[PDB]
């Protein structure tokens, strides 16, 4: 019981920070599991999920440079 995957907003709710969707690199370290483009999230940031498993995710930056995606849920491992 946390919450069904529960977009915790402009970061994951283990406690990472998401960045922006227009900021994403076109280095990615991390492969989506689709085309993200129609998360239409691009001025912002902010947990994204149209489909996939009603599961909210994010593209995040940590503190060690890196930018990863990582689901909206709670502690998604």
Same mark, same amino acid.
């Given at each position: 019981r946390c919450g069904a995957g529960e977009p915790w907003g402009n970061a994951t709710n283990l406690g990472v920070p998401c960045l922006h969707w227009d900021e994403v690199?076109?280095? /990615?370290?991390r492969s989506p599991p689709?085309?993200?483009?129609? /998360?239409?999230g691009q001025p912002h940031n902010f947990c994204r999920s149209p489909?996939?498993?009603g599961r909210p995710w994010c593209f995040y930056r940590n503190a060690q440079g890196k930018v990863d995606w990582g689901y909206c849920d709670c502690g998604q491992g």
């Open positions: 690199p076109p280095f /990615l370290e689709a085309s993200w483009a129609e /998360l239409r489909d996939g498993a």
